[PDB]
């Protein structure tokens, strides 16, 4: 399938993708921005420590009412939250990313996450039950994710 | 159309409820349940000057 | 109701046999476009009404 900004050096670059998976979009957008440009065996050790609340994730654009935390100052920010499902789906994809890099014969301890973008999927619907006999909908927001992995050499 | 859009029992909702005063179809259940009925404006409506 | 006249449980027996999926071979014929049975009834969302 087709990506945005297919990489500058396709011989020595891996790629990976997962689509129509149910996370929140906003919790996934602002954790893919924190590792955008992070070395893979540092990002792998990072996203473990996000789920264990040992290293946070700042919310930058999508922060309406998000409470404050003390581990955000490593990022220079006053807000954060520790999404252990959002950072746990794309922890699985780094395993999928390094599975294709060794199949193309690349040293997986030398990759960085060059490109990553999270964009929305078709929202699936259900319904809630409100006062005075009305119905208002629950709707999800699944996401499409996409990453290119390039080494620096 | 011999008789298009008038083959429908509908009326204006009348009072407030923050809707326009176009005639609405009746009932419940199905999709086409409170929609805008006949009138050139509305979907599934009798056209202006149904030609003779 | 546990006390049902015989016309009722020959009316119920029709409405149980049709609550049943399409067989997978009939979605492979030449020129169909049915892909799931849309007359499926589930006993809490939509009731027969006698």
């Amino acid at each position: 399938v087709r990506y945005s900004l297919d990489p500058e050096n396709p011989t020595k670059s891996c790629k990976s993708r997962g689509s129509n998976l149910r996370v929140h979009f906003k919790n996934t957008r602002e954790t893919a921005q924190a590792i955008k440009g992070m070395h893979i065996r540092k990002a792998t050790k990072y996203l473990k420590d996000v789920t264990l609340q040992k290293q946070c994730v700042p919310f930058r654009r999508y922060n309406g009412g998000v409470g404050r935390c003390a581990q955000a100052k490593q990022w220079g920010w006053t807000q954060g939250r520790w999404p252990k499902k959002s950072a746990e789906f794309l922890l699985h994809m780094l395993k999928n990313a390094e599975s294709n890099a060794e199949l193309k014969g690349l040293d997986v301890d030398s990759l960085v996450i060059e490109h990553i973008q999270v964009n929305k999927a078709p929202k699936m619907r259900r319904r809630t039950y409100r006062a005075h006999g009305r119905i208002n909908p629950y709707m999800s927001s699944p996401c499409h994710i996409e990453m290119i992995l390039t080494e620096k050499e | 159309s011999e008789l298009a859009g008038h083959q429908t029992s509908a009326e204006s909702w009348g009072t407030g409820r923050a809707v326009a005063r176009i005639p609405r179809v009746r009932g419940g259940g199905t999709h086409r349940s409170g929609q805008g009925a006949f009138g050139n404006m509305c979907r599934g409506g009798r056209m202006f000057a149904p030609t003779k | 109701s546990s006390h049902k006249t015989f016309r009722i449980k020959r009316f119920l027996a029709k409405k149980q046999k049709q609550n049943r999926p399409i067989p997978q071979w009939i979605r492979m014929k030449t020129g169909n476009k049915i892909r799931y049975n849309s007359k499926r009834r589930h006993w809490r969302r939509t009731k027969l009404g006698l």
Binding site: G133 | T30, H31, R32, G34 | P21, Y36, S38
Partner: peptide, 26 residues
């Protein structure tokens, strides 16, 4: 590979408008 189900029209019943009548004795 289950077939699509439900998504029926809401068909919500009409309720009363503006709550209490209130008004001004004047």
């Amino acid at each position: 590979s289950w077939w699509p189900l439900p998504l029926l029209l809401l068909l919500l019943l009409l309720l009363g408008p503006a709550g209490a009548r209130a008004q001004e004795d004047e």
